Tab-separated table of C-alpha atoms in Angstrom:
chain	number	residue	atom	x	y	z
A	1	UNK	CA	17.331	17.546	8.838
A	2	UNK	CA	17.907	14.626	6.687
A	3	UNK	CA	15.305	12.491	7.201
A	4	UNK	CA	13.215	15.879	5.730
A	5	UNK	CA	15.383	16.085	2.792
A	6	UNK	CA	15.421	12.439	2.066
A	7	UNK	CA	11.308	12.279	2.557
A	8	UNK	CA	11.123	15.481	0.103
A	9	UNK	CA	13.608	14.149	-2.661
A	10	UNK	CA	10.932	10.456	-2.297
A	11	UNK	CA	8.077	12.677	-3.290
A	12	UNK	CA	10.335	14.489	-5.879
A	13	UNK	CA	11.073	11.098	-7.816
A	14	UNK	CA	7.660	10.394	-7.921
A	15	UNK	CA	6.708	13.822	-9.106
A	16	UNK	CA	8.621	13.298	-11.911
A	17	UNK	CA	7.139	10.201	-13.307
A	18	UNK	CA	3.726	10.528	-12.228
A	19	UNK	CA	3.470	14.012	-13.912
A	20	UNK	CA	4.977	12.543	-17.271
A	21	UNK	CA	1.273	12.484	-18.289
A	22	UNK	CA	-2.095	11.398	-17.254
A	23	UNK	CA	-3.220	11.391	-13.531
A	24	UNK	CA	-0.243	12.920	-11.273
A	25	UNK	CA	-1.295	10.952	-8.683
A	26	UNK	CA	-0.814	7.583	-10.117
A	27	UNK	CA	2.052	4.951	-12.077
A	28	UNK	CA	1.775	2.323	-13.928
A	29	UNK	CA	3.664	-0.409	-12.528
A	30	UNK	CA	5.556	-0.210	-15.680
A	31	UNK	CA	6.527	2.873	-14.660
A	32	UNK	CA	7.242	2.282	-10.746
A	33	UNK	CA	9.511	-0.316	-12.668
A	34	UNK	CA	11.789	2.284	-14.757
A	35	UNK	CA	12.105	4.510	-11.524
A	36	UNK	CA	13.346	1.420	-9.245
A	37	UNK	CA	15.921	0.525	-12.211
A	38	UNK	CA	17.158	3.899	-12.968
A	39	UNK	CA	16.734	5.889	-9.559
A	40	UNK	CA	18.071	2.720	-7.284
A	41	UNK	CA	20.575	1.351	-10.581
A	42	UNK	CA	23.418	0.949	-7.503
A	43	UNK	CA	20.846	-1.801	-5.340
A	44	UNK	CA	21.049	-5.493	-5.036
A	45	UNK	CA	19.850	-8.190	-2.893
A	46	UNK	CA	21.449	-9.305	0.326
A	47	UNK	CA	22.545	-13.095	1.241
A	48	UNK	CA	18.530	-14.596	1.955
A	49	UNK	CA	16.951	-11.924	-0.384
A	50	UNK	CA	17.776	-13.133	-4.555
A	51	UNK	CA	14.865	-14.636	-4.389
A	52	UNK	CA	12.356	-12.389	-2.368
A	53	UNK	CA	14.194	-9.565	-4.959
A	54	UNK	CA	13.885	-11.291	-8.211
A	55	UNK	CA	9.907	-12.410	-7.703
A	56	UNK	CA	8.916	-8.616	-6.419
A	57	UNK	CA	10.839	-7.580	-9.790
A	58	UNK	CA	9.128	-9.963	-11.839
A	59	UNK	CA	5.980	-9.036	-10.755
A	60	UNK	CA	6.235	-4.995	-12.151
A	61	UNK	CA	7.210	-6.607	-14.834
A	62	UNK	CA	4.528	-8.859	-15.531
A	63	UNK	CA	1.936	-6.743	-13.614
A	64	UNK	CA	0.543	-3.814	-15.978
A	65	UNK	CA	-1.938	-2.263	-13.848
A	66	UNK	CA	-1.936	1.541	-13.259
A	67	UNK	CA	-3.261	2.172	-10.150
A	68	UNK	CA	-0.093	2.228	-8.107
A	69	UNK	CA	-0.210	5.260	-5.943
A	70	UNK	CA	2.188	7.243	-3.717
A	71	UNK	CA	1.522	5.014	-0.898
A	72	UNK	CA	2.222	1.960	-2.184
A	73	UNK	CA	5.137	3.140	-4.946
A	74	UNK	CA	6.396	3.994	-1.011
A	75	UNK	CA	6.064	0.944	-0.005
A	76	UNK	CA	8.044	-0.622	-3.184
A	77	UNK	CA	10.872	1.403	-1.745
A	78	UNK	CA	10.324	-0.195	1.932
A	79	UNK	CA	10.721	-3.966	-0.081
A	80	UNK	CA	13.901	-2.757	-1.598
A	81	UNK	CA	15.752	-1.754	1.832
A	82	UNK	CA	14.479	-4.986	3.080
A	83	UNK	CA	16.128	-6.635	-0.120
A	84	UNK	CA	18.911	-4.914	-0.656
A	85	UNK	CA	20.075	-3.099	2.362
A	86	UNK	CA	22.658	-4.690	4.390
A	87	UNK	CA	20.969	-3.859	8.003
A	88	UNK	CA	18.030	-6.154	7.067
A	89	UNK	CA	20.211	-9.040	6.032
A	90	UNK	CA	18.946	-11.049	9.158
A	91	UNK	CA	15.527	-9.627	9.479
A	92	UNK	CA	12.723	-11.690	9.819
D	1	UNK	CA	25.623	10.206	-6.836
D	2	UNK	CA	21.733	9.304	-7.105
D	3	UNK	CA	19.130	11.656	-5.052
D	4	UNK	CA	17.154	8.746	-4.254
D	5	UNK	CA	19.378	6.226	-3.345
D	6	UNK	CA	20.831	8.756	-0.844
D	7	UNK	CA	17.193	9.920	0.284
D	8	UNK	CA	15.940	5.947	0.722
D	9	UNK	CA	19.992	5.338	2.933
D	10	UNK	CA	18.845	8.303	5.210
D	11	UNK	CA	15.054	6.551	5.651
D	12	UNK	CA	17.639	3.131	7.012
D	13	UNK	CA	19.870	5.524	8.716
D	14	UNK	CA	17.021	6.934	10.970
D	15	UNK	CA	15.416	3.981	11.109
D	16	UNK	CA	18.747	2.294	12.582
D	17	UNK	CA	18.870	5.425	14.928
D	18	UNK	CA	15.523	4.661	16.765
D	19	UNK	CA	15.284	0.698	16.461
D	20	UNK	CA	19.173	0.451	17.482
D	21	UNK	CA	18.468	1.950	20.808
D	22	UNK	CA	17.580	-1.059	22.766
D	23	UNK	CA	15.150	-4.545	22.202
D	24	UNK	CA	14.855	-5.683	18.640
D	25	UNK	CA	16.752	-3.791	16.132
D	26	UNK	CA	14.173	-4.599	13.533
D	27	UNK	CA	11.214	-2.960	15.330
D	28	UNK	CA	10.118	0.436	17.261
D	29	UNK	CA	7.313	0.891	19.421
D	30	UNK	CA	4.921	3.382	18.400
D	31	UNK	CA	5.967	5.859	21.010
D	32	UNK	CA	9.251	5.742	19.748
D	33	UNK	CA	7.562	5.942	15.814
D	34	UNK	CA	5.817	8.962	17.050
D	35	UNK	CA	9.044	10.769	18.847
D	36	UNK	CA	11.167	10.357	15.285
D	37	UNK	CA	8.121	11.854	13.231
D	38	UNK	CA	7.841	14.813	15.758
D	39	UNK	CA	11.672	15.345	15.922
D	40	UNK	CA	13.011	14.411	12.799
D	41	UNK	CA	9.792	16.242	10.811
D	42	UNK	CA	9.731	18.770	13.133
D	43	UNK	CA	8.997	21.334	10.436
D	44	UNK	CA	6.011	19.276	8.224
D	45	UNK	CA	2.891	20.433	8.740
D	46	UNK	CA	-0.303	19.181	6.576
D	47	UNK	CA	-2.520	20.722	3.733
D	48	UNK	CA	-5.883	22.583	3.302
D	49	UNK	CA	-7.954	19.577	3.300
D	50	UNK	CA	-5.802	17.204	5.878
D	51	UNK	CA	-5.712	18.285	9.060
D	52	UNK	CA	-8.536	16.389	10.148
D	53	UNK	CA	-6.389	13.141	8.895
D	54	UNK	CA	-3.428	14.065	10.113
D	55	UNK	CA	-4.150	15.040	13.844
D	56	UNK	CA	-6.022	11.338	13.827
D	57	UNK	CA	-2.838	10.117	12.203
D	58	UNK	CA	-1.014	11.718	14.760
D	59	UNK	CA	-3.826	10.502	17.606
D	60	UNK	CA	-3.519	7.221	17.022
D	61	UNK	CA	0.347	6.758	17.660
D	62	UNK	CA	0.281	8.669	20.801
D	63	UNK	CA	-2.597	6.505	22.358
D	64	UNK	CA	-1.835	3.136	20.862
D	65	UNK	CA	1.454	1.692	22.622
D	66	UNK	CA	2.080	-1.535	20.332
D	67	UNK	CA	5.663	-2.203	19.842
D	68	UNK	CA	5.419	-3.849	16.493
D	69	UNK	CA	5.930	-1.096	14.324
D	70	UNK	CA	8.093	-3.022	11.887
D	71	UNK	CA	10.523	-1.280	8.808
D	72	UNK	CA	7.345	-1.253	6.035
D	73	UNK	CA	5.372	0.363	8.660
D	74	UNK	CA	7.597	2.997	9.342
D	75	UNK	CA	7.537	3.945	5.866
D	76	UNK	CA	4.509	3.519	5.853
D	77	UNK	CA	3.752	6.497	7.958
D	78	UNK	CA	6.186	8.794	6.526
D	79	UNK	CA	4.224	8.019	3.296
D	80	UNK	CA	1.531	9.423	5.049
D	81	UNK	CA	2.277	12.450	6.234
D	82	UNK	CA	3.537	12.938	2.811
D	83	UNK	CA	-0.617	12.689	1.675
D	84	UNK	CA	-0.934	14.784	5.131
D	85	UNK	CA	1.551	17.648	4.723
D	86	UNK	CA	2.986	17.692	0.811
D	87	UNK	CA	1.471	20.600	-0.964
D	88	UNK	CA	2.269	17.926	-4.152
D	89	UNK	CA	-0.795	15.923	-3.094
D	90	UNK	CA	-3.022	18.472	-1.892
D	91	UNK	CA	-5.882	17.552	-4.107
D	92	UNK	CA	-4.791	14.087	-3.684
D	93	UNK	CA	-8.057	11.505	-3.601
């Protein structure tokens, strides 16, 4: 079933660098900022979404925290579709 | 050809499947959250020390009708049977 696969291969990425070292649970936003740019490299905001895009990227960037979990590291993935996918261009 | 770009299309493409149906493309009611988990997880099941979380998880959808279940939200909860049913975060605080 593909939503399966697609759900395993989420917690895959993650497992590979949240196990890098320390807790296995957790990134560093750091981190949660490499995976976004090298597992999503192909991603770019739609027409009303540069600027939602650019200020959630600046804010990994900026942010060095390490307490992102699964959850929200989930949820990063939620703000790109909303960004970058075209079936949210007109979403409110 | 990137494993998770294809995995986080398929999360849109079954999202697209549900919410296209009828009403407001950008939203599902939670009926219709909890008919995708049950069909398109069919086969996830949780961990040792989740089942208590996960049949509440599972409670709550079925009971609570409220058809604002918007795209983060539906992540949301497949997030969370991730935590409920992923041996990965079995020991997961």
């Amino acid at each position: 079933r593909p939503l399966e696969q697609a759900v395993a291969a989420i917690v895959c990425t993650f497992q590979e660098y949240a196990g890098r070292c320390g807790d296995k649970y957790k990134l560093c936003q750091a981190e949660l900022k490499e995976l976004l740019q090298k597992e999503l490299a192909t991603w770019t905001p739609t027409e009303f979404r540069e600027c939602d895009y650019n200020k959630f990227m600046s804010v990994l960037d900026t942010n060095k925290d390490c307490e992102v979990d699964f959850v929200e590291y989930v949820r990063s993935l939620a703000c790109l579709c909303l960004y970058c996918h075209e079936y949210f261009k007109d979403c409110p």
